[PDB]
Amino acid sequence: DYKFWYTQPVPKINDEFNESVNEPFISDNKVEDVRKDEYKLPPGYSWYVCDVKDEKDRSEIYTLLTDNYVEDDDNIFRFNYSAEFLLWALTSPNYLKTWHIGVKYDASNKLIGFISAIPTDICIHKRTIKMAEVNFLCVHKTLRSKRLAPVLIKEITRRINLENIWQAIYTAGVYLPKPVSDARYYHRSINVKKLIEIGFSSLNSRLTMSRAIKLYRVEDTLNIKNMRLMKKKDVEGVHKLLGSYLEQFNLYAVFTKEEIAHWFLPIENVIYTYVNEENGKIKDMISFYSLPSQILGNDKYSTLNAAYSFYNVTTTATFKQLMQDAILLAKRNNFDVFNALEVMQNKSVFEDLKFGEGDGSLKYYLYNWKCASFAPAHVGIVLL
Ligand SMILES: CCCCCCCCCCCCCC(=O)CSCCNC(=O)CCNC(=O)[C@H](O)C(C)(C)COP(=O)(O)OP(=O)(O)OC[C@H]1O[C@@H](n2cnc3c(N)ncnc32)[C@H](O)[C@@H]1OP(=O)(O)O
Ligand SMILES: COc1cccc(COC(=O)c2sc3ccccc3c2OC2CCNCC2)c1
Ligand SMILES: [Cl-]
């Protein structure tokens, strides 16, 4: 049963829609009727408006996530998004401070809950809808299974609806009512030895340590020799290349020139974008973001450095060549592992490029939207 989810404008567990259905569950909503009062929290807890632009507020959000955010099923790893990453993720064009919602415990003044949204135009099945992208829902490990999460969700929904937005996109590893797509992740080993010493990867009697190192070795030469860090001048070119590529997919964000500069211009230890320019034209792009995991209870290593495949477009190479280059660029930036979802064209290169299947999948969800579900090849958006 999904006692909370079932009260919400999302599909029931059995709902399945034709490709021709593509619409809200609840249309003709009115901003004027949205509740003005904040949702009621348990006694001794208060809403707090986080200023992601303030170093100190931002560090409180960081601590909460470092200690309490997503772990894998074996709880060896916990996501450790850096402060400077959270600042990029939360301050895209037209972002609203009042969509960055904390909850404090009054007696300690400590942040013990968070939820965020940013505004994004989302094209679902060729209809572009102004939506909210929701992320970084977190409750402190000590406060789990007390029905705080639905209060966080309902408060942000109300804050979102105040801006006349009635749809959202979000992703979770947990299964909820009901995904529009479901994409397994794959991982390409870069620093083999580390990955074995921490348990992520393993050896058979056939595959010895030296043999595993050799298996994953890469040639430090790019397939596209002029692939270079993106610069401000490249923004219009990236806009045209990415914008045109993304139109083939069933689900994707429609990016303005301003969002392209926000989402792609490199920031050390956050976002890496490389371009291939020919006649002042951007004809190829690789991008990936930095998402470390903290390694729980390993005597030797505290952090796994991990590049996450973001948006990759080639017109002068094979997609395999392009991704092979993405892997090398991540190795050049001291990543231990390169992670990708089986979205867009990704899956076609995983065998050849020596990716291993992960343990699970990332589900893609819409709020207050009814449509046909689809295979993840047709997914054209990567969240943070
Ligand atoms: C138009 C605007 C629309 C606005 C909003 C759109 C929707 C946005 C939705 C959010 C999108 C966020 C995307 C995102 O951030 C990326 S997915 C990452 C979520 N964060 C984590 O997993 C961190 C580790 N865990 C936690 O901090 C807690 O376990 C959380 C806070 C997850 C749940 O706290 P708790 O102490 O374990 O649980 P209770 O408080 O007792 O609450 C249980 C109720 O929460 C439902 N639940 C559990 N996990 C969920 C999840 N990941 N999405 C949605 N729902 C989730 C659950 O199914 C149940 O409902 P039910 O009884 O019906 O089954
Ligand atoms: C620490 O636990 C993990 C250990 C190993 C692997 C994972 C992976 O989980 C995910 O959801 C993934 S993979 C991937 C690969 C490329 C691009 C995105 C993602 C992704 O979603 C991201 C976007 C949604 N918000 C969290 C990360 C977890
Ligand atoms: Cl209610």
Ligand SMILES: [Mg+2]
């Ligand atoms: Mg709770």
